[PDB]
Design a protein around this ligand. Structure first.
Ligand SMILES: [Zn+2]
Ligand SMILES: [Zn+2]
Ligand SMILES: [Zn+2]
Ligand SMILES: [Zn+2]
Lengths: 196, 833, 103, 83, 120
RNA sequence: GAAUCUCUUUGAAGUGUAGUAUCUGUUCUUUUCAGUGUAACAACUGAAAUGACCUAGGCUC
């Protein structure tokens, strides 16, 4: 029932834990440091975790942290689409514009069950501080994602470009964020996503 | 789980087959079913719930549903007792009940006293003695009055015993006028009868305590004995027997009243009436005054001799009792007995038909043995030689018993060479010719051989010839019988310096040690134990170092006696022969026992633990401790506890300087059960050393630092158990400063509940009272002595009760009492000269 | 007793007589049931001796004892030695459910 | 069961050893036990008895002993008052 | 020393005299709490055990690993308890009226007392 | 007993008495008053205001 995980003793002076909570004290029993509850067997531990008691103490601890100050069914063919970066310019500075093209009714003919099909591609700015390899980092990426196709990134060394100032007249349909509504276009009829 | 459904008694429950009065009404009967028909784990819980809530449920529904259950014929001794236990716990809980339900319960649990087994007799007494305090005198007296008038012999017999248990519980002084009511009642005949029997069971239950109360009862005997009713007259005579035997010679001054009519009853009514009368007078004989004993004994002995021919069983049983008691009389001479009583005794009462019935055979033997004291021993056994050679096997058995009990008391030193020869000859004959399976012959024969020993040598050889002759036989009964006889005869052979003969015995037994039958094999190993114990090891033939490796597989034979005698003998080689067996073989022994002590036997388990002392003396103590500590990690409680015992004994024989440091590391191990085994092993290793722990105390206190502080009530419990022995044996050494610490950690645990925790902590604090002295221990008790909390108070007054029990003068100077503290104070404490 | 709770004691002024225990119970201090360094022989009141009941084991109350019971050195210092007459009057739930369990 | 036995042993120990505070005991009941045991030891030891005899200055020592005995009962104060 | 709950003392004038008598040591205050005297959060972070350094000299620490055969000299062990460790005594112990409350941990006070010693 | 040939291999579970701890599930105030209870709580036991007015409150009716 332990699923082969090693829970170190409390006195062993902390490898990442699944839940950094259940420990074993100086004795052999298992304890929840937050809940301060003793548990005889790992089954009792799982009852504790699945119990509302522990959860309440987790929310209380999160409140203490603030005081101190669809995802499953996601289809994934991991297919790299074709981007068309191009140095743009208007007035009064310089901005970037990307032209991402998508399938020509080649494989999207088998999936049409209004499952987020109406949802257009989405962009987000990610810091390289977190990667599957975690080697080098220190720059941002303008990630672009669509359900079936594979994610795409574009490095942005410049601290700020095209970061405008009240372009439109403050209309509030947040969509996803100010970035997406502010500067993206989704030609859904031709399947072309423009971003600038 | 409701294990083992009862269809008829469950459909008798009805209730829920699928509203507070309906909820208690249902759950109550549901629990009752859990107890009667259910699962052990279930019924154990329903007991605790039923007792905790026993005050909540109305006794009307409790007894209303519960009581009629026991009226059925489909109950079993298991289940009926399962309900009986609830009866006891509930009656002792509520403590107050109305008279109709008192009557119901007394009628239900009343027949229990009559059941054949003292197991049921005991609890049947418990329900009644617990109910007596509940209902009281007046209620129970109002209960027995309508019942004693019943025409049913069975029920009258029942509430005779029940009324007796009540009389003992609430005292016979309060219930005595009732005894005078049914006693002296002129109305009913059965009321007279049972009114007399109640005196019987009162006398039996009180025993010697009947003395101070014997005045009122003898009134009933003297006045009610004169009744013209033969059964009444008989029962009175039995009451004189019981109250005389339980009386002991004191009561003569009171019995002198009823002394007279017994004789005029004897010389007249005769018959079974004279049987009961001579039982009474016979019981009077020991309490008679020496002159009066002289007269009345000589008066009775004539009637006895005349009545030797009584065809009836009861009268013969009585006669044997009267001779049994009259034997102790100094007036009648052993010359008189040998000239008249004894010859007319042995010829009449030793007839073969006598030996057929055991309950008579008892009184025959005990009577004969009481005769042996006054009679010459050589004369008694002289008359006892002919019954030994009779061809009837049970008659030979009784013939043995007489020799056993006689020779144990007197001994055979009175016998001449010739009849001494014929004695051992007869014993060998009956021993080798015995048909029946019984354990007496080798026991009593062994008793004779222990009585006379140096004289045995020329018989000692043929006796052993018969021994080997039976050691080869096709019946395991005769096998283990002869082996048991061997183990008994081994010490005697040493007196004849036959030692080579002991060697050939050791040979043959060692060669037969490979027998399949465990029951015989165990006895064989017992004979091995006696041989090796008696004779020097060097001259032992096999020799020992060849013996033991054949013993190492024996430990796995399971059963019981095999490991009993096996562990005994392995221990014998453990203390006697350290050098012979190789140390690795001793390690195999350690592993085998370490696996072996899972057995359920406390003798096997205890002796098994004891052998580790000898093995620790012979071999490496650390070597033993490795296996022991490695076995502490096992979940089984017997393994943990008795491995802790082994650690204790090893620490006793080796000394704690070796064992303790490794123990402390085994405590450093995080595992709970291991830490518990450590703390208990520390307790035992301390109780086995009185003067040693004094030097070791300081190294203990940092370990008890984490023990007493530990969250687990178990660790706090067993640590307190350490402080018990450690404090008792280290008290007065001067370590009080350490004891002060150890206590300072204990005081907060006083409020801890549970029975085990509370008694371990109480005993610990009492041990601290001896090491610290009351004064400081007092100071804590005082500053907590009263307090508002109603809880703190109840807790500390326990410790102060035990302190007041052990110490009083010791606490006298330490009472924090001043003239402003209390009004009167004591004017004499301030006096200074 | 120290372990089994429901066992009831006597606690009267002990007489000259010495209590007997069976070979099965041999070695136990009748209070604490300890096997170590026994000191003084138990003494029971006359009310616990009289007839056949005198032969019983003062500990297990059933078997007929040969051996004398001794108090340990821990009870002799705790004074429980002199407390009163040790005996077990009630057989106890353990022994009861044992006998009814087997038969 | 266990606590229930502790009640019976409470009755027995209270019977033998007289005053043992159980749970609720009045200060009059308990202080009486204090006085009784203190006087008990003062007269019990020939030592402390000899001591109180001289420090008090009585003509004889048994006067002090039987004084303590009498002083054990409460009414002895009023008894002295009536002399 | 007297506290608000002493008002309901059935014999308050007496209980004040006893509780305020010279050498009496007031009841440990973990009563009136229902936590069974140890719920302590600090109990979670207590060290399993530490050998007294004199016993740690015996080297059985290395011989047997308690953390997640072993034969040693009788003279060595005996001398550790007696020759080396006769005058040895635990460093902390406690005093006349020291009582251990739940939240207390002696170890930090041991390093404290030792530190008031070393550091000047 | 000795001699030869072929082939193969190696190099067990379990019980009962008492008692404890720990999960988890589940429960929860409309307001008062008085009693029990409590160290005080808690808890338990009984009843029930309806109407009007003023800026939590009322010597209110
Ligand atoms: Zn938790
Ligand atoms: Zn007794
Ligand atoms: Zn016994
Ligand atoms: Zn003892």
């Amino acid at each position: 029932l332990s699923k082969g995980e090693n829970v170190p003793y409390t006195f062993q002076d902390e490898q990442v834990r699944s839940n950094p909570y259940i420990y074993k004290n100086h004795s052999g029993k298992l304890v929840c440091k937050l809940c301060n509850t003793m548990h005889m067997s790992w089954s009792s531990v799982e009852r504790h975790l699945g119990g509302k008691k522990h959860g309440l103490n987790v929310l209380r601890r999160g409140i203490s942290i603030e005081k101190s100050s669809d995802f499953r069914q996601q289809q994934k063919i991991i297919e790299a689409k074709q981007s068309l970066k191009n140095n743009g310019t208007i007035p009064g500075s310089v901005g970037l514009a990307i032209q991402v093209n998508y399938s020509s009714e080649v494989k999207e003919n088998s999936v049409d069950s209004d499952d987020k099909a109406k949802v257009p591609p989405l962009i987000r700015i990610v810091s390289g501080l977190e990667l599957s390899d975690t080697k080098q980092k220190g720059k941002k990426f303008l990630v672009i994602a669509y359900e079936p196709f594979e994610n795409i990134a574009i490095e942005l060394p410049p601290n700020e470009i095209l970061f405008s100032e009240n372009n439109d007249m403050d209309n509030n349909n947040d969509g996803v964020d100010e970035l997406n509504k502010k500067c993206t276009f989704w030609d859904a009829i031709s399947k072309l996503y423009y971003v600038q | 789980d409701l294990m083992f459904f009862k269809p008829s008694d469950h459909k008798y429950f009805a209730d829920v087959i699928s509203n507070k009065d309906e909820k208690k009404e249902r759950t109550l009967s549901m629990l009752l079913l859990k107890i009667k028909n259910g699962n052990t784990a279930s019924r154990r819980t329903s007991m605790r719930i039923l007792t905790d809530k026993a005050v909540t449920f109305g006794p009307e529904m409790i007894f209303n549903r519960l009581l009629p259950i026991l009226l059925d014929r489909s109950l079993e001794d298991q289940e009926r007792h399962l309900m009986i236990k609830t009866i006891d716990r509930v009656l002792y809980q509520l403590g107050d009940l109305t008279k109709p339900y008192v009557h119901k319960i007394l009628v239900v649990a009343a027949p229990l006293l009559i059941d054949e087994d003292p197991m049921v007799r005991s609890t049947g007494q418990e329900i009644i003695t617990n109910l007596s305090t509940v209902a009281g005198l007046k209620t129970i007296l109002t209960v027995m009055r309508p019942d004693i008038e019943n025409e049913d012999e069975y029920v009258r017999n029942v509430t005779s015993r029940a009324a007796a248990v009540v009389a003992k519980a609430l005292g016979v002084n309060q219930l005595l006028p009732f005894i005078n009511a049914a006693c002296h009642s002129r109305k009913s005949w059965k009321a007279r009868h049972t009114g007399i029997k109640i005196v019987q069971q009162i006398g039996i239950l009180l025993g010697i305590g009947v003395l101070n109360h014997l005045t009122g009862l003898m009134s009933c005997i003297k006045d009610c004995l004169m009744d013209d009713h033969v059964p009444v007259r008989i029962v009175t005579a039995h009451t004189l027997s019981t109250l005389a035997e339980n009386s002991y010679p004191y009561g003569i001054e009171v019995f002198n009243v009823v002394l007279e009519p017994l004789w005029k009853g004897i010389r007249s009514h005769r018959g079974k009436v004279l049987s009961s009368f001579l039982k009474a007078v016979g019981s009077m004989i020991p309490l008679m005054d020496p002159e009066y004993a002289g007269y009345y004994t000589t008066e009775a002995m004539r009637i006895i001799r005349r009545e030797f021919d009584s065809p009836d069983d009861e009268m013969k049983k009585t006669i044997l009792l009267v001779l049994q008691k009259c034997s102790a009389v100094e007036s009648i001479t052993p010359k008189f007995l040998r000239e008249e009583i004894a010859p007319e005794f042995f010829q009449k009462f030793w007839v073969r038909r006598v030996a057929l019935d055991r309950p008579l055979n008892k009184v025959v033997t005990y009577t004969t043995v009481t005769l042996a004291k006054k009679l010459g021993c050589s004369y008694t056994i002289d008359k006892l030689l002919t019954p030994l050679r009779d061809e009837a096997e049970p008659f030979r058995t009784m013939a043995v018993h007489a020799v056993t009990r006689t020779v144990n008391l007197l001994g055979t030193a009175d016998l001449d060479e010739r009849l001494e020869t014929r004695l051992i000859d007869a014993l060998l004959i009956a021993f080798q010719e015995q048909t029946n399976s019984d354990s007496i012959i080798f026991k009593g024969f062994g008793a004779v051989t222990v009585s006379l020993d140096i004289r045995m040598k020329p018989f000692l050889a043929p006796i052993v010839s018969t021994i080997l002759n039976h050691l080869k036989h096709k019946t395991p009964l005769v096998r283990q019988h002869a082996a048991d006889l061997c183990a008994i005869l081994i010490p005697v052979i040493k007196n004849c310096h036959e030692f080579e003969m002991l060697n050939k015995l050791n040979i043959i037994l060692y060669e037969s040690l490979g027998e399949v039958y465990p029951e015989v094999l165990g006895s064989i190993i017992n004979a091995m134990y006696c041989i090796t114990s008696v004779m020097d090891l060097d001259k032992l033939q096999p020799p020992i170092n060849q013996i033991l490796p054949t013993l190492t597989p024996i430990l796995r034979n399971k059963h019981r006696k095999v490991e009993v005698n096996t562990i005994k003998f392995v221990g014998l080689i453990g203390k006697l022969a350290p050098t012979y067996a190789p140390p690795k073989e001793w390690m195999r022994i350690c592993f085998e026992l370490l696996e072996l002590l899972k057995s359920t036997n406390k003798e096997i388990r205890r002796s098994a633990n004891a052998t580790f002392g000898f093995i620790a003396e012979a071999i490496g103590p650390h070597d033993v401790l490795v296996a022991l500590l490695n076995n502490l990690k096992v979940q089984e409680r017997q393994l943990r506890v008795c491995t802790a015992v082994a650690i204790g004994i090893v620490a006793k024989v080796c000394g704690p300087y070796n064992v303790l440091p490794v123990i402390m590391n085994e405590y450093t191990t995080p595992e709970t059960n291991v830490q518990n085994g450590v703390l208990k092993a520390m307790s035992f290793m301390f109780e086995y050393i009185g003067n040693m722990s004094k030097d070791y105390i300081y190294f203990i206190t940092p370990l008890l630092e984490d023990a007493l502080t530990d969250r687990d009530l178990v660790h706090r419990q067993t640590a307190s158990n350490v402080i018990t022995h450690l404090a008792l044996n280290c008290s007065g050494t001067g370590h009080e400063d350490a004891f002060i610490h150890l206590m300072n950690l204990l005081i907060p645990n006083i409020f801890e509940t549970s029975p085990h925790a509370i008694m371990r902590i109480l005993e610990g604090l009492e041990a601290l009272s001896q090491a610290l002295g009351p004064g400081l221990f007092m100071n804590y008790i005082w500053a907590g002595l009263f307090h508002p909390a109603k809880n703190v108070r109840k807790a500390f007054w326990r410790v102060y009760n035990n302190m007041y029990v052990m110490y009083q003068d010791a606490m006298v100077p330490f009472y924090p009492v001043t003239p402003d503290n209390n009004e009167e104070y004591i004017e004499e404490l301030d006096l200074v000269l | 007793s120290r372990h089994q709770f429901d066992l009831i004691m006597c606690l009267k002024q002990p007489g000259v007589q010495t209590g007997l225990l069976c070979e099965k119970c041999d070695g136990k201090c009748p209070i604490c049931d300890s096997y170590v360094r026994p000191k003084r022989k138990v003494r029971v009141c006359e009310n616990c001796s009289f007839g056949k009941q005198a032969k019983n084991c003062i500990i297990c109350n059933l078997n007929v004892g040969v051996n004398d019971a001794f108090y340990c050195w821990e009870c002799c210092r705790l004074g429980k030695d002199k407390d009163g007459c040790p005996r077990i009057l009630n057989l106890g739930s353990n022994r009861l459910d044992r006998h009814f369990e087997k038969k | 069961a266990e606590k229930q036995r502790q009640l019976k042993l409470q009755k027995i120990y209270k019977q033998k050893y007289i005053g043992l505070g159980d749970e609720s005991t009045t200060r009059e009941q308990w202080q009486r036990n204090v006085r009784n045991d203190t006087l008990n030891t003062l007269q019990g030891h020939s030592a402390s008895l000899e001591y109180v005899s001289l420090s008090r200055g009585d003509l004889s020592i048994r006067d002090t002993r039987i004084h303590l005995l009498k002083s054990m009962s409460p009414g002895y104060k009023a008894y002295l008052r009536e002399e | 020393i007297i506290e608000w709950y002493d008002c309901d003392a059935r014999y308050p004038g007496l209980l004040a005299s006893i509780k305020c008598t010279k050498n009496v040591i007031p009841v440990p205050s973990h009563w009136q709490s229902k936590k069974e005297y140890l719920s302590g959060r600090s109990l979670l972070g207590k060290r399993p055990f530490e050998l007294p350094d004199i016993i740690k000299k015996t080297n059985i620490e290395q011989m047997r690993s308690t953390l997640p055969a072993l034969d040693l000299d009788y003279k060595k062990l005996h001398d550790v308890f007696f020759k080396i460790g006769a005058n040895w005594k635990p460093d902390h112990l406690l005093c006349f009226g020291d009582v251990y409350y739940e939240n207390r941990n002696l170890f930090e006070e041991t390093n404290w007392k030792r530190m008031v010693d070393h550091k000047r």
